[PDB]
Amino acid sequence: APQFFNIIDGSPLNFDDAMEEGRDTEAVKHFLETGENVYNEDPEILPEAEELYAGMCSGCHGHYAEGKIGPGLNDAYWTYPGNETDVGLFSTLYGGATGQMGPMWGSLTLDEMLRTMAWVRHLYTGDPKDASWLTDEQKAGFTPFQP
Amino acid sequence: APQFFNIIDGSPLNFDDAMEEGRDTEAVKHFLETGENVYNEDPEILPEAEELYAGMCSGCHGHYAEGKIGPGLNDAYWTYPGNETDVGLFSTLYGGATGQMGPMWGSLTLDEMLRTMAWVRHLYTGDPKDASWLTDEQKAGFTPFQP
Amino acid sequence: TDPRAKWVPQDNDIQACDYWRHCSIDGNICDCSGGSLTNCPPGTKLATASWVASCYNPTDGQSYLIAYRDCCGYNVSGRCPCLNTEGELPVYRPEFANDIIWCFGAEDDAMTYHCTISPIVGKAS
Amino acid sequence: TDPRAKWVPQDNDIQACDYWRHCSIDGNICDCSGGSLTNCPPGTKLATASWVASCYNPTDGQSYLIAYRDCCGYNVSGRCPCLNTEGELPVYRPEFANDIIWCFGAEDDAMTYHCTISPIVGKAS
Amino acid sequence: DKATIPSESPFAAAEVADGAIVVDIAKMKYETPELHVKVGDTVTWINREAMPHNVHFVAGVLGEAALKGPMMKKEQAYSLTFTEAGTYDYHCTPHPFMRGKVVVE
Amino acid sequence: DKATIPSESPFAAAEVADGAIVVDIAKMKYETPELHVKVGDTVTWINREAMPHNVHFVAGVLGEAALKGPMMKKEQAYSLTFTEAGTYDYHCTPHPFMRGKVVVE
Amino acid sequence: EAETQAQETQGQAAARAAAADLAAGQDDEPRILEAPAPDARRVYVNDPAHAAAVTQQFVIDGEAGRVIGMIDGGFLPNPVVADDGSFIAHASTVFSRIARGERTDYVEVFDPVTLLPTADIELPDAPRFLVGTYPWMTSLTPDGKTLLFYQFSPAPAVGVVDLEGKAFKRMLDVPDCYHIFPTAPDTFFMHCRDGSLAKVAFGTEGTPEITHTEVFHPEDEFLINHPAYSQKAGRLVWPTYTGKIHQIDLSSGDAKFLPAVEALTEAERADGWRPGGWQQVAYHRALDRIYLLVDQRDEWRHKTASRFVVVLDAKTGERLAKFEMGHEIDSINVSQDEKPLLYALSTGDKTLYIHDAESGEELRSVNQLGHGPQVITTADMG
Amino acid sequence: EAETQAQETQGQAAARAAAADLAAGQDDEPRILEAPAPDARRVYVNDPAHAAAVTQQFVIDGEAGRVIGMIDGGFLPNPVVADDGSFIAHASTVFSRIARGERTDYVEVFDPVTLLPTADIELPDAPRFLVGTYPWMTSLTPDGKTLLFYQFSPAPAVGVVDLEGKAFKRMLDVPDCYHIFPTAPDTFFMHCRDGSLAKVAFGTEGTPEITHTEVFHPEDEFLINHPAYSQKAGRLVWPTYTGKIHQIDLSSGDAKFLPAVEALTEAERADGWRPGGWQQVAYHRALDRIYLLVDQRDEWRHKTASRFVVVLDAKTGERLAKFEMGHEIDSINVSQDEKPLLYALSTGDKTLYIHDAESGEELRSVNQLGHGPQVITTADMG
Ligand code: HEC
Ligand code: HEC
Ligand SMILES: [Cu+2]
Numbered sequence A, B: 001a002p003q004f005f006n007i008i009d010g011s012p013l014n015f016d017d018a019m020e021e022g023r024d025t026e027a028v029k030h031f032l033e034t035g036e037n038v039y040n041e042d043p044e045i046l047p048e049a050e051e052l053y054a055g056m057c058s059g060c061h062g063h064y065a066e067g068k069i070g071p072g073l074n075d076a077y078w079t080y081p082g083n084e085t086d087v088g089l090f091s092t093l094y095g096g097a098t099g100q101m102g103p104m105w106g107s108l109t110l111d112e113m114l115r116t117m118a119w120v121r122h123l124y125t126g127d128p129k130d131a132s133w134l135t136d137e138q139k140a141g142f143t144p145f146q147p
Numbered sequence C, D: 001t002d003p004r005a006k007w008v009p010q011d012n013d014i015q016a017c018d019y020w021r022h023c024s025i026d027g028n029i030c031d032c033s034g035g036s037l038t039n040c041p042p043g044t045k046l047a048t049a050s051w052v053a054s055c056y057n058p059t060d061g062q063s064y065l066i067a068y069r070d071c072c073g074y075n076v077s078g079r080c081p082c083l084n085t086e087g088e089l090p091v092y093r094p095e096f097a098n099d100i101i102w103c104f105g106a107e108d109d110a111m112t113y114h115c116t117i118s119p120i121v122g123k124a125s
Numbered sequence E, F: 001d002k003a004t005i006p007s008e009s010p011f012a013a014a015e016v017a018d019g020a021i022v023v024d025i026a027k028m029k030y031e032t033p034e035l036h037v038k039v040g041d042t043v044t045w046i047n048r049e050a051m052p053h054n055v056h057f058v059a060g061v062l063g064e065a066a067l068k069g070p071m072m073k074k075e076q077a078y079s080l081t082f083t084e085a086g087t088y089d090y091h092c093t094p095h096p097f098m099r100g101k102v103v104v105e
Numbered sequence G, H: 001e002a003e004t005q006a007q008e009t010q011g012q013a014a015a016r017a018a019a020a021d022l023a024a025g026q027d028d029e030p031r032i033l034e035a036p037a038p039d040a041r042r043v044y045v046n047d048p049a050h051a052a053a054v055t056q057q058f059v060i061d062g063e064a065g066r067v068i069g070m071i072d073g074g075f076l077p078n079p080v081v082a083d084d085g086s087f088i089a090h091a092s093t094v095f096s097r098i099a100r101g102e103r104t105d106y107v108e109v110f111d112p113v114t115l116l117p118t119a120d121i122e123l124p125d126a127p128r129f130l131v132g133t134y135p136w137m138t139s140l141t142p143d144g145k146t147l148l149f150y151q152f153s154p155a156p157a158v159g160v161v162d163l164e165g166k167a168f169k170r171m172l173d174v175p176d177c178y179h180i181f182p183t184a185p186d187t188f189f190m191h192c193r194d195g196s197l198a199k200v201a202f203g204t205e206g207t208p209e210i211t212h213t214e215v216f217h218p219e220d221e222f223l224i225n226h227p228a229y230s231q232k233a234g235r236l237v238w239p240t241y242t243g244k245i246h247q248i249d250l251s252s253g254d255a256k257f258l259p260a261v262e263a264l265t266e267a268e269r270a271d272g273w274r275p276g277g278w279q280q281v282a283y284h285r286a287l288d289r290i291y292l293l294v295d296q297r298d299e300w301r302h303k304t305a306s307r308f309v310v311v312l313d314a315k316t317g318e319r320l321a322k323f324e325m326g327h328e329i330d331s332i333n334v335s336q337d338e339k340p341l342l343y344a345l346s347t348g349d350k351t352l353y354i355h356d357a358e359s360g361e362e363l364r365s366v367n368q369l370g371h372g373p374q375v376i377t378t379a380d381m382g
């Protein structure tokens, strides 16, 4: 399985602090086992995923993850290089970063995280060929974002 | 004998005004008869001719007759074409021209005039071949004047 | 040589237009008027901003980003002129346009073109 | 042709340097920038003073004095340059020197050289 | 007048203060377009790509004359301590399409 | 002004009355270098050779501005009427070594 | 010593007259000439002189292939030409000490016949955009009363110059857009980085009114810096690196994208044909045709000279013809009269080759056009 | 585009070295270079650009055949070079509209290393004599504190420029004489129309004391506009059209006319050999030798290039050598050190050919030196 560490101090992420709701979803399991988020570009999830990101992130990161009060999340550059993979991105939300970006394990369930993450990926404006967090089939149906 | 007229009003020049002293000289006799000035480029005469010009013409025509108050007298251009000959040059001195240039019969004798004329022609700065008042032996002997 | 033929870079003479760091240079090679491959000539003003291009280095097979900064405040050197356009984009994509006089930031506000340097500012794709 | 060989005038093309009235012209032939054999081009200023030279006309075997007046107030035309020096004397004999910018007397005090005309001002020796 | 320059020329990113306000630059853009700071802070732009970038405030923003900051190469920084309070719009000299803003409250 | 110009352009010498004040120009020189005249007189210069010649009085001499006379071709004349006593020097524009003066009394 | 057939005949004819004049007893009396009245065949060649401090513009009679005049210029100036031939002008730049010192941007206006400057309007704070000469980076409004110039720094702007009242008006604020294509006394469109065209109506005061059009070209399609624009037919012909053409009808005062056309054939594009040069396109209004400089070349040598010129029906995109110019041509343009002339300028030869636009045959030429002539400009009269 | 046999060399060196810094991870950090300290092998090349409005001077290191700097100029500027290498300067002219408008004459002084201007002294009422560049039509005083320039119209005169105090002093009325050869801080000589020499002594104010020497040459002997003058050795070498050489010794503060010498052999002058070019003569102080550009030509082709250069003993007049330059040379000069360099400049090839003065062999060359390079200036150091 994947290594789930705090992107900052290196310590292992303690999943005992994870709320009990949404730790069972076939997505949360598949993710913890494989490290793959089955919600990426998932038509039956996006609508809601977007809403999660809407009232949970758009405030600091922008209406399209372009950036505002906080950094941009819609391009190939990542202050924390690991975020180019869902395992790293996950660890970021769960364990926190610095400043007004602290551990989400209190407000989001393990499933709501993977959904929100899925939308953040959908907002990617880069080139499909680059979307390394996507299977081949998904890279084929992916179109860089545009409001 | 060459006609002697006043270069301006064409009236014949009256020689009764000429000083009685100095009409006899062979030069005057030969000049009046052949319009030729035997003194042209006559070494024996040049010394007094230069001096005769000094006290009488330099004041108005320049030290080397290059011209000053009156027109220059040392080149090929004459305000009065006739002055390209000794009969013409003589006529100008004797009868005068206009303005400051008056007759010279009161201050110079016929011989003294021919001498002054000889000095003037000696100041000629053109090329010998152009001195149309000179004779071969005088030409080849005469050299464009230079201070 | 053929002007329309593909550009073939070389890494043995910086005063030739086919020198690899010049793949998108426009103007004159500074090294020909008192400067060097990467420095302005005496009396000129060094610009800060500039256009760029990813030039391939035949020596190590890597590609580097060249920042074509101009040396300004002087009339065109007139020595060693070159015009290459590998990856050069129209003016509406300034970051890669080389018809622009990249003299912005030069001391004394010099805006006249004299020559261009070919310094490496990083590795490219 | 041989630059050092004696000058051989012709009377059939005023835009060539061997045209007879140009035997002592320095600069550019005005007829090549909007003027004519004897007139300045539009916008330029016609000088009054100038240098001269006696040019031989192979057509009638006569020699004429050419007054090389300059057309000024413009940068060198750069078209049809010629430099002939038949009878051209050093600067201490200005009346025949053609390295001098003969723009004196031109309107608006124009003193920049643009081109030179070759007008005839009289017969010579 | 409305800010100062802790360092005239760009310095290696390594020397950047941990926890210090930072606005990374990459993919042709100021990753944090509407940075909000309070009087006294020292914003520090840091370039992350090969393409050289800088910060440029027109005249009348951070003072009488414009501030044409220096071009930062990959992994270089440039700081600015905002003295007065208010909004301060800037841009990248060679890339007029790269805008940024630093609101000081 | 110290002088008025009868004719702005050179005119045919054959049009000059015999007896008129005249200064011939020939052999690269003004035949009468130190011409003396009276106030009101009109001086007429006449070029007698192929070489073009003009008369040129620098500024402040015959008036505020300098009088740059037009070039006379062979057999062409130029005039000037002096209205005030004084000594006015001149030269030939392209031939500065050619000089002359008019003494108006 | 090298003279073109045209200037040789001119020279000969000139000798003929001067000879007969002399013999007939005529005297030379030098004067300052007036240029012949502007006309359809009048052509203007501007020489940027490879970015020199001083430049020159050659005024030519394309019919006779003769230089009828010149106009001096400063650093990388922008030339304009009233279509009706009433006047010509340019936006120039000069420095107090050659290429250094105090800078001064200004606009001069010239009498089309005397070439005498009729207006010298200074521009405040060196606002001019100093770049390789692009015709449409400085433009004349249809009425000929206003000149519009571009500004790249500190931010995209377009200055307004009141030619009539000989005075600078103001600097309008515009988006990331480039080029100026006036359509009305107070309106011009610009091309934006986002692939859209921008309409900028402006008045005597107040922020201008701006509106964008649909994006008309993908991000990986590159529109050359030298599009052809007929202010009379409201036609804007814009090529790409591949020859694909984007025509935009502005005659209605509003953008209206026409059917994109491919200047190069399927065969050609396959065999490596691509447009290349400086002023790559030309458009004849009356015949409503498009002229494009093309040749076989690698995809990044888009600024080298081309030896061929193809002509297509702007309407049907049909291939009308393909000419072999026989020279390294960097720029082309045409006279707008009934039977147009095809101007083909070569920067390398500092020569202007004047051909017949119908047959493509070279009629005459004019050499010694500066150190690196790049822009041809003709006026649409009538 | 061609590269001189010395250009490739310098080009590869730069490559090899850059490639190395790269391989060693040494980051490129651009700065404004300074030129190497002036030395005996330094040589300046001025390009009057065929009387173009703006000009250029090229600072060249004659040893390596490399351009180490350049300095912009105006219309027909007069250049000067301090023999001690402490500074360079020139009298230039610019206008407010390229070649038209307000004229402004001025003197600029430059730092031989930074090439930055240390002084910009304006000259009242455009006093400069606009003529093809004659080195000695603007000269420095032995102590390098004053600059003297000639004025032709409306009358002969020389202006005094205080370089040390950076300001125009005054105009000096002089006889109908030309050229300037400073022999002291308050004294200089001129060549007069009558064939004499003029000695001018000037104070800080008042009319200067002028005295003429004997007439040293016939009225039909023409002294070229480009004589060689070695201020240190007060030697004045003045050739005539035929190659006859008049020598004047000005060391003693007064003109001492040395015995004339014929630079071309009796046989040569018989076959039509004559000097010709622009800077036709050079003089090497230390060696006391003369170098004259010569070739076979008609008598009125004195400004055409020559392919030969003969060397003679200044004192005796003994022929020492005759080099075949291999190119059309317009101007020559030499470096004043041990084994001097024979500089040969071609206005046509815009190339400077550097030869070994001793052997006459071409060591290297430098091209693309402007549009019409004509004047070579060196410094007599040590
Ligand atoms: C303001 C209170 C924020 C909200 C709401 C969210 N984020 Fe955030 N985030 C914020 C800051 C100030 C930072 C910078 C942290 C640092 O020290 O660099 C971040 C950073 C991230 C990152 C890291 C991206 C990178 O540059 O590598 C990620 C992946 C991220 N944030 C995700 C994220 C999500 C999914 C959010 C909604 C649930 C969200 N953030 C909200 C500030 C704020
Ligand atoms: C001043 C009082 C004069 C003295 C003394 C002399 N001359 Fe003169 N001369 C004078 C004038 C003002 C003029 C011009 C007359 C005119 O009508 O233009 C002249 C002219 C002559 C000429 C004519 C020259 C020509 O170009 O044709 C000659 C030959 C001449 N003068 C001779 C001359 C001699 C020999 C004199 C000394 C005895 C002499 N002049 C004195 C004024 C004065
Ligand atoms: Cu940027």
Ligand SMILES: [Cu+2]
Residues within 6 Å of the ligand: F028, F052, F053, F054, F092, F093, F094, F095, F098
């Ligand atoms: Cu004269």
Ligand code: NA
Residues within 6 Å of the ligand: A071, A072, A073, A074, A075, A076, A077, A078, E031
């Ligand atoms: Na990002």
Ligand code: NA
Residues within 6 Å of the ligand: B071, B072, B073, B074, B075, B076, B077, B078, F031
């Ligand atoms: Na006389």
